[PDB]
Amino acid sequence: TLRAAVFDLDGVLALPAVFGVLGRTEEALALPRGLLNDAFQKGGPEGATTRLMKGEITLSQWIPLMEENCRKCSETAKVCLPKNFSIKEIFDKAISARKINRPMLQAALMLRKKGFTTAILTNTWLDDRAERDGLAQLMCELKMHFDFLIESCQVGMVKPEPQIYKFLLDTLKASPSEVVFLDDIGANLKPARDLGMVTILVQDTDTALKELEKVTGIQLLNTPAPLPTSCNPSDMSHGYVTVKPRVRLHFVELGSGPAVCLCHGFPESWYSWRYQIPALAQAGYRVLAMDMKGYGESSAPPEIEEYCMEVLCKEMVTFLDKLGLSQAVFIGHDWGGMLVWYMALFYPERVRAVASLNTPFIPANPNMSPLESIKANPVFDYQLYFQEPGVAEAELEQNLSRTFKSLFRASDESVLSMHKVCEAGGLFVNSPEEPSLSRMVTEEEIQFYVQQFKKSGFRGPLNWYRNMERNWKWACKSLGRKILIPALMVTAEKDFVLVPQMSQHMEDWIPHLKRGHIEDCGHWTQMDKPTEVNQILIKWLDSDAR
Amino acid sequence: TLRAAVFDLDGVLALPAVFGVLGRTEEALALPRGLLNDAFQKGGPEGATTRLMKGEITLSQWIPLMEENCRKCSETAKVCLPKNFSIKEIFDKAISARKINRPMLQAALMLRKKGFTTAILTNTWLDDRAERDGLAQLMCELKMHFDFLIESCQVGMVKPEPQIYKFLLDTLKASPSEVVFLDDIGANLKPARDLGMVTILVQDTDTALKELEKVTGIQLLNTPAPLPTSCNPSDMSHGYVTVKPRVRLHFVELGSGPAVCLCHGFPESWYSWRYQIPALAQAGYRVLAMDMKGYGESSAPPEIEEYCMEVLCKEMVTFLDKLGLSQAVFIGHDWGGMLVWYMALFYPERVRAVASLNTPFIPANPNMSPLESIKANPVFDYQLYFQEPGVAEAELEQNLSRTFKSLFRASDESVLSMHKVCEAGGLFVNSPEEPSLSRMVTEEEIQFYVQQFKKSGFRGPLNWYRNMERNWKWACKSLGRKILIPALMVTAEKDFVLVPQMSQHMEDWIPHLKRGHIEDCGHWTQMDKPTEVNQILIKWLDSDAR
Ligand SMILES: Cc1c(C#N)n[nH]c1-c1cc(F)c2c(c1)C(C)(C)C(=O)N2
Ligand SMILES: Cc1c(C#N)n[nH]c1-c1cc(F)c2c(c1)C(C)(C)C(=O)N2
């Protein structure tokens, strides 16, 4: 029975193959057929290319050797290489054109999810070209999805040499019959077949995957669209910043580029952005996913006033100051969305751009108490239930698994009644003790939240709703302002509290506002519709946030 | 007696003053004198500019109001504003031209170092211009050096209103006679004088500082050149990455821009780069100052093999992978310098550029044991003393304060004998029990190292020297290579072990090598000559690392 799958890089996980460019150049330059491929492999195991692949020399040292073999091959064939003939330009173009073969990576992803040990085995080089970063980026993206990456230049062995295959088996800790090996070079497949491995000669991806699914007995072709890459908490870089003597803020950090600070809502975590973090970092951004004050590994002081918008905003500014960041793009959801609008209003110099999921920007009404305003709409009753210190804490901390299983459900999986929460005596009065696991979350994801909330519970998080008068007084100071920095409002069709129509007047205050809208999306936006959130945010960042 | 100093921003801590540009524009455009200054202050406390300064409106909302006042003022004066008249272009230019008034900041730095509470009090605006980042950067740089920053647009009060001064005194927690207040606007100084504060009208910086030193009795003018800004460990962002099940790496992180990974030597810390971190972040880089494996908050496994170059290098690559960084520039000192050369040799695709302080690149000799090679040079005897497990640990951990006070000394303060360490029975056999504090370090800086080394001691750090055979075998694999990526070698005139002449053959292996050289500099480069290290590294990063 198969339990390991090995994939080649060039022509398998990455296309067009760097090899096939030798043939295209020959055709474009009307050079003899195979001339460039012949000079490339000149000398066989004793040649320049084999030394390169074994790590003996770098790609920049190899370039002039390849030039010399091209001269030699042209001399024998009685032909002339054109004037501006440059191996460097040829390879720079070839490497740059090579992209991840998405359906092949997806097949590798499915096998690993099904218990297979996955590996990349490749004949590669030590790239010291001025433009080496392109390749480093590709290898970085691919490698994360596999258990092992074996590079010829790092192990000092090359395919089709028999030793690299015995090295492969030792690393996999598997016998040959337990391994599927995919390669686009028949010669490099031969030693694996001879050892007893299942071998697939990759020409076109589709046929290779048909062979792959037939041999593993796992559906790899025609499968439903996959969810974006998530986060394993133990594999992330965790950051800690003391913003004031008793207050430390924790964050998860991934990527390089403009700083994007993600601000979760109630009662969530940095982990609510798990599907966005890898995607935004891959799109060219340095993602800082916060544990907001009161949550996870961030400090959770008991005092109500520690959670008013003015203090929360000041601490996020100090957070930027200590990290040495003059600005970040601020993206928030729910309570996080409310904070990001106020960051844009009070600290525009520190906000590169602002985006909110579900949370509209509604200006304070100076002629009405915020208590009055909340009472007017019956969908906001849960917020009145949250007012009395200790009440909501007791019900929410009673059974954490039940709390998170009951909350984190799709728009059609509701087990909760939002009207008359106070009157009924709680959110879970007529809700199950052991709710079914929502289609949106796994047991493992729920247990992560349970573990996070064991530290500080619900006091700090609930205190975010306990500053209505303080927040209204502060917001009133901003009534003569407009938000004029880049801004994005994302509405969720099925959020029954933060309804899309509540955002209808935002253009009066944010004239240049851009929008996104997600159909069949409930309140828990990021995990409800991650692909669509990713598409909207990446499109908007690339156009408005640089 | 004075105990607090307050400085204005425009015309005091920052020059040329944004205000004086109104006069320059009038002169360049041959407009009536004071026309632009008159339209700027139009309406006084009821005017557009006062609303802006109080935070009622943003700078982008203010721009068209100022345009309207300029039209009104030109109409009354019977003059015409030219065609391409734009207040935005005028202010964009003015804000951009404004730079930190270095001698004023230095005077503020000296007073704070001498016990004064320092503050910035400014009439400023909420900047939402597309180019607001320039100003955010300036405010960020300045604010870090003061106890308080009071902005008119944030407090809803403006100078010369009496309330902002009572607000200032409350924040300082000082009576008026204890305060020196510096301002370039006589009108804004008046309420502070009336309250009983010492007031300085700032016209030219030099005279203002003369008045400042006369009143405080502290030398502020003609003072010796200051050391660069250092780091307070409790104010930094601390990062943690698990590179393998038993190995976590800690780092300090500051700035935005290309990633610069700083790698200390033996027996040091992330804190060895304290004078470089703020400087490199200010120069436009995202600094990652490591605690190398075996040190500080990083894991320190006991096994010798855990510290060979191959494993150390692989873990730094994984560190990049987990942070989502395809590359970083690698800067190392001593053992860190040795690691960075090997990163450039084995992982060039992951190394944007490489720089070493003191540590030359010397290729392995395949015809000689590294044990043999070390014995040949008497200055390397300390490395033979480090070979036997437990010996050096016992002497170095015996008294931590003594260890660090004895080590961290300038080239002329040596209390250590480097010849015949083994024969004499240790590094400190004929060295003081209570050494004098070197001119390079404070007691506080020494106690930081003492505290760091209390966690894991010297085993892990010493293990870095216990892999000579393993390292030599690995280095031999690289003998046919050259380092062809951007590289910088920094020599220290007075390093008696890592002598500048040991670097003389490096061009044979790194043909495009750039150099720096520091006169009168011992082994502890970063703290011996921080200004010169900063100058060399920033010049080289800006030319070769982007
Ligand atoms: C129940 C609850 C708690 C708790 N404890 N925190 N936040 C919310 C909540 C907030 C919302 F905005 C929306 C919803 C729930 C539903 C009803 C799913 C919706 O459609 N919107
Ligand atoms: C003594 C010691 C220890 C310890 N325990 N670690 N490292 C060093 C050391 C290394 C060097 F390279 C140089 C020096 C000291 C001096 C003599 C200051 C120099 O000039 N170079």
- Please indicate if any CB of chain A lies within 8 Å of the CB of B253: yes
How much of chain B is in helix, strand and coil states, percent to nearest 5?
Answer: 45, 15, 40
Contact A445, A437 (CB under 8 A): no
Question: By the 8 A CB rule, do B316 and B292 touch?
Answer: no
| Helix (H), strand (E), coil (C) string for A436-493 | CCCCCCCHHHHHHHHHHHHHHCCHHHHHCCCCHHHHHHHHHCCCCCCCCCCEEEEEEC
Task: Name the closest-CA residue to atom 14, ligand 2.
Answer: B523
Distance CA B375, CA A474 (A): 72
Cβ burial, residue A222 (10 Å; 0-12/13-18/19+): exposed
* A484 interface with B at CB cutoff 8 Å: yes
d(CA B313, CA B340): 8
Q: How far is it, in rounded angstroms, from Cα B21 to Cα B94?
A: 6
> What is the number of the ligand closest to the CA of A379?
1
Sheet strands (E) in B341-460: 351-357
Please provide residue A288's backbone torsions phi and psi, each rounded to the nearest 5 degrees: -120, 100
A440, A408 Cβ separation under 8 angstroms? yes
Sign, CA torsion B293/B299/B304/B305: negative
CA distances from A443 to A275, A405, A437 (A): 17, 9, 7
Q: Which residues are within 8 A (CB) of B74 and not within 5 positions of it... i.e. 6 or more apart? A: B31, B35, B80, B81
**Edge-first strand listing for the sheet containing B198-201:** B148-151, B117-122, B4-7, B179-183, B198-201
Distance, CA B253 to ligand 2 centroid (Å)? 28
DSSP label of B350:
G
CB contact under 8 A, B234 and A242: yes
Decide if A26 contacts A33 (C-beta within 8 A): yes
Rounded CA separation B131/B153 (Å):
19
Method: X-ray
In sequence order, the β-bridge partners of residue B480 are none
d(CA B308, CA B466): 8
A540 CA to centre of own chain: 16
May I ask the CATH class of domain A1-16+97-217? alpha beta
Q: In terms of DSSP bridges, do strands A198-201 and A14-15 run parallel, antiparallel, or are they unpaired?
A: unpaired
What distance in Å separates the CA atoms of residue B448 and residue B533, rounded to the nearest whole number?
A: 22
Stated resolution in angstroms: 1.9
* CA–CA separation, B40 and B27 (whole Å): 16
Taking the C-alpha atoms of residue B273 and residue B248, their distance in angstroms, rounded to an integer, is 20
Of the CA atoms within 13 Å of residue B47, those in its CB half-sphere come to 15
Per the listing, tokens 């067009």 go with A16
Q: Using an 8 Å CB-CB cutoff, list chain B residues near A322.
A: 235-237
Query: Can you state the angle between helices B309-323 and B335-346, rounded to 10 degrees?
Result: 70
Angle (CA) A211 A216 A220, round 5°? 65
CATH 3.40.50.360 is the classification of domain B17-96: no
d(CA B496, CA A377): 78
- The answer to whether residue A240 is catalytic is no
Q: Which residues of B are designated catalytic?
A: 334, 465, 523
Nearest CB among A51, A143, A322 relative to B237 is that of: A322
Q: Which two tokens stand for residue A365?
A: 């009404």
Question: Is A131 an 8 Å CB contact of chain B?
Answer: no
Inter-chain CB proximity A61 and B484 less than 8 Å: yes
| B312/B471 Cα distance (integer angstroms) | 11
Could you tell me the distance, in angstroms and rounded to a whole number, from the CA of residue A411 to the centre of ligand 1? 10
Residue A242's DSSP bridge partners are A248
Q: Where are the alpha helices (DSSP H) in B98-220?
A: 102-113, 133-143, 152-155, 162-172, 186-195, 205-216
3-state secondary structure of A354: strand
What residues in B contact A478, CB-CB < 8 Å? 55
- Phi and psi of A28, rounded to 5°? -65, -40
Contact criterion met (CB below 8 Å) for A516 and A379: no
β-pair type (B237-244, A198-201):
unpaired
Hey, which residues 3-22 in chain A have their CB within 8 Å of chain B? Answer: none
Q: Which residue of B has its CA nearest to A62?
A: B481
Q: Is B443 exposed, middle or buried (0-12, 13-18, 19+ CB in 10 A)?
A: exposed
* Cβ contact B327–A58 (<8 Å): no
Provide the 3-class DSSP secondary structure of residue B262. Answer: strand
Query: Partners of A491 in the beta sheet?
Result: A517
Report how far residue A545's alpha carbon sits from residue A257's, in angstroms, rounded to the nearest whole number.
11
**CA dihedral sign, ordered B508, B513, B514, B516:** negative
Two domains, one topology: B1-16+97-217 and B17-96: no
Cα first-last separation, chain A = 50
Asked if the Cβ–Cβ distance from A239 to B254 is below 8 Å, we say no
- Whether residue A505 lies in the annotated active site: no
Q: Distance between CA atoms of A444 and A452, rounded to whole angstroms?
A: 13
Sign of the dihedral through C-alpha B179, B180, B185, B189: positive
Q: What are phi and psi of B283, to 5 degrees?
A: -75, 0
Element (H, E) at A117: strand A117-122
Best residue for ligand 1 mutational test, from A335, A357, A418, A421 (most atoms within 8 Å of Cβ): A418
Which residues 6+ apart lie within 8 Å of B280 measured at CB? Answer: B255, B260, B287, B534, B537, B538, B541
Q: Is B63 an 8 Å CB contact of chain A?
A: no
* Residue A330 buriedness (CB in 10 A; 0-12 / 13-18 / 19+): buried
What's the CA gap between A93 and A192, in Å, rounded?
A: 32
> DSSP class of residue A404?
H
Region A236-546: CATH code: 3.40.50.1820
3-state helix, strand, coil in chain A (%, to 5): 45, 15, 40
Q: State how far the Cα of A444 lies from the Cα of A234, in Å rounded to an integer.
A: 13
Q: Which helix (H) or strand (E) holds A392?
A: helix A391-397
Interface check B323 vs A, CB under 8 A: yes
Q: How far apart, in Å, are the Cα atoms of B42 and each of B50, B51, B58, B512?
A: 9, 11, 17, 61
Cβ distance of B238 and A240 shorter than 8 Å: yes
DSSP 8-class letter at B171: H
Task: Give the type of residue at B123.
Answer: N
| Chain center to CA of B531 | 10
Neighbour tally for B360: CB within 10 Å: 19
Query: Does the annotation mark A145 as catalytic?
Result: no
Interface test with A, best of B95, B326, B484 (most A CBs within 10 A): B326
- Determine the distance separating the centroid of ligand 1 and the alpha carbon of A496, expressed in angstroms: 8
Q: Report how far residue A458's alpha carbon sits from residue A416's, in angstroms, rounded to the nearest whole number.
A: 19
Nearest ligand (C-alpha, residue A333): 1
- Give the tokens for residue A203: 């020409």
- The one-letter code for the residue type at A519 is E
Contact between B11 and B19 under an 8 Å Cβ cutoff? The reply is yes
Reading the block at residue A56, the tokens are: 């003996």
Cβ A73 vs Cβ A42: under 8 Å: yes
Q: Please state, in angstroms and rounded to a whole number, the distance separating the CA atoms of residues A479 and B51.
A: 12
For chain B, give every domain's residue range: 1-16+97-217, 17-96, 236-546
Which residue is associated with the tokens 């290779």? A208
Provide the 8-state DSSP code for B435.
P
Judged by a CB distance cut-off of 8 A, whether residue B442 touches chain A is no
